């Protein structure tokens, strides 16, 4: 009944005719990654509600675990990979998608394959600021090497410099066309120039004022244009990194102490504001219950730790180090709360590395 595809999701009958198909309402590369690894999505929730409201119940899918999430959620779901929906839809897309269907397969398939690797840098906002300076320094080297390329090539064909002022189009001319007597009307259209630009350039083929480069003088100028082509590919490598990494956001406490312990500690302080105001000496003892009471009211020994005892390097650990680790944990915890509350940037794997150096030093000392 269901069939599972890139150009939306599809429903077919027992005789192999179409019933309905629907297009996606999040980025299709993320919708395919869910549906391929067997968890169900909002546009398929709507297509199976359409199929239910039409008066069908026998919801055979292609995939076993997509069908698991469907019947675990409450639907009348079963599984057959060779079912008549997939046996029609994947045999002839022309009847359903249109003749250019392979463009839509291509543009999402390469994106899914570029996306199937997870990301966890330690201080990624700083590690993207360096790529914003790399974009400033990359246009800066392009705007230097192309000035040398202009001045050197204008010895041989100066009639081009003021006519192709956008630097990539001049580099592509000097890379791909190269020597001035190669220039004809067809190779300028194979370079993507318009008729208004091709009346000029060809105007100069019979009457240029430039002085001669020989066959392996023009070669080193072509080597320079072939390496500057890779600097435009490096600009794409930076543009494709910035479009992926500059959208990240992560909380620090959630990584330094783990989400459930962070969320608990924020409330024993009354709030995240208080956890970002209070001293480490107080953050050390938050929620110690009747051990803090008898330290104040009855004048007992101070508690070594409150709810920070649930920290995964204190809870299991031997006595010699539990107090020393609790003090340094309360300092590094007070820092992580101040970063999440005042700054909204991420450094949590640095804060871990420093507490990990202090724990190694505690072993090296005791």
């Amino acid at each position: 009944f269901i069939s599972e595809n890139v150009r939306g999701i599809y429903a077919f009958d027992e005789n192999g005719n179409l019933i309905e198909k629907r297009y996606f309402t999040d980025k299709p590369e993320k919708v395919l990654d869910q549906l391929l690894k067997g968890e169900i999505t909002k546009d398929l929730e709507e297509l199976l509600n359409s199929l239910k409201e039409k008066g069908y119940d026998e919801f055979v899918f292609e995939h076993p675990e997509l069908s698991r999430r469907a019947k675990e959620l409450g639907f009348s779901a079963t599984t057959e990979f060779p079912n008549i929906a997939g046996e029609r839809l994947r045999s002839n897309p022309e009847e359903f998608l249109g003749e250019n269907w392979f463009e839509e397969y291509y543009k999402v398939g390469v994106a899914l394959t570029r996306m199937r690797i997870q990301e966890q840098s330690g201080a990624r906002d700083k590690m993207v600021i360096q790529a914003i300076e790399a974009l400033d320094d990359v246009d800066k080297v392009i705007n230097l090497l192309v000035a040398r390329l202009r001045e050197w090539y204008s010895l041989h064909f100066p009639e081009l410099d003021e006519l192709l002022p956008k630097h990539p189009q001049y580099v592509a001319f000097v890379k791909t066309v190269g020597h001035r007597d190669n220039i004809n009307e067809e190779v300028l259209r194979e370079l993507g120039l318009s008729e208004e630009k091709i009346k000029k350039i060809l105007e100069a083929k019979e009457k240029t004022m430039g002085a001669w480069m020989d066959q392996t003088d023009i070669e080193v100028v072509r080597q320079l244009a072939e390496e500057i082509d890779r600097l435009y590919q490096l600009r794409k490598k930076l543009e494709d990194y910035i479009d992926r990494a500059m959208d990240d956001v992560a909380p620090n406490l959630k990584a330094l102490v783990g989400a459930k312990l962070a969320a608990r500690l924020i409330s024993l302080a009354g709030g995240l504001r208080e956890l970002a105001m209070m001293p480490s000496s107080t953050i050390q003892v938050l929620g110690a219950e009747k051990a803090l009471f008898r330290h104040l009211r009855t004048g007992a020994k101070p508690p070594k730790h409150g709810v920070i005892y649930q920290y995964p390097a204190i809870n299991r650990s031997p006595w010699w180090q539990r107090g020393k680790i609790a003090r340094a944990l309360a300092g590094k915890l007070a820092i992580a709360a101040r970063v999440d509350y005042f700054s909204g940037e991420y450094i949590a794997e640095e804060l871990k590395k420093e507490l990990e150096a202090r724990i190694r030093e505690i072993k090296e000392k005791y």
Partner: protein, 227 residues
């Protein structure tokens, strides 16, 4: 300094090399592209790329005299364990601008190097997922004319057979490079090749078998038809 010529199969080419030997090649899908750092060959308005039989089972099998080659211009094909392809990428040149290639890979890194090459090799689509589990990529593929497997994983008989239930047409074909060690490391290679020959003939017409010595040892290549 070479002479360029046509081969016995369409889309496949030969060069006469300066050493006085025949070497196998394809006409480059777009001219000026590099694909495995290879010896590219300029011609009189054309560009060609070598298909090296000293590091490619497909090229070595053609030099060992493989008879039945079903991949041709304009057709549709699926490759299982593709990475990018010193051995494999040449199917894109042979199928050309009018045909279709699906490249499936299980190996969690190498397909990342095919991803840039397809910004001009726009007849290929790369998809990451286990070739043993033909359901893993169901949304980005179709029925095809040909299926190929060349990495020789322990599952390889299931890799070709069950992909050929979902993805191979009536009057369709396939190819597989079988190695004995992935199924048993103790019994004879020609005996393991019988156990595969009797399972492969439990679903296909088996049209050819070839051993890959004196290039690569205890590996063989089979060719099949779906009726």
């Amino acid at each position: 300094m070479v002479e360029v010529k046509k081969h016995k199969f369409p889309g496949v080419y030969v060069v006469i090399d300066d050493d006085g030997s025949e070497k196998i090649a394809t006409k480059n899908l777009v001219p000026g592209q590099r694909v495995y750092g290879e010896r590219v060959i300029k011609w009189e308005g054309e560009e060609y790329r070598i298909w090296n039989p000293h590091r490619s089972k497909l090229g070595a099998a053609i030099v060992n005299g493989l008879k039945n080659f079903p991949i041709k211009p304009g057709k549709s094909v699926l490759y299982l364990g593709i990475a990018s392809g010193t051995t494999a990428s040449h199917v894109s040149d042979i199928v050309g601008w009018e045909g279709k290639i699906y490249g499936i890979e299980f190996s969690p890194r190498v397909l990342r190097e095919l991803v840039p090459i397809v910004e001009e090799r726009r007849n290929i689509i790369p998809i990451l997922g286990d070739a043993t589990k033909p359901e893993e990529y169901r949304a980005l593929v179709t029925k095809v004319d040909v299926i190929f497997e060349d990495v020789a994983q322990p599952t390889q008989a299931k890799i070709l057979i069950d992909n050929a239930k979902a993805y191979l047409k009536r009057g369709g074909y396939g190819m597989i490079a079988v190695k004995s060690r992935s199924i048993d490391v103790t019994k004879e290679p020609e005996q393991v090749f019988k156990e595969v020959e009797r399972e492969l003939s439990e679903y296909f017409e088996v049209i050819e078998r070839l051993n890959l010595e004196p290039y690569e040892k205890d590996h063989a290549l089979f060719v099949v038809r779906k009726p």
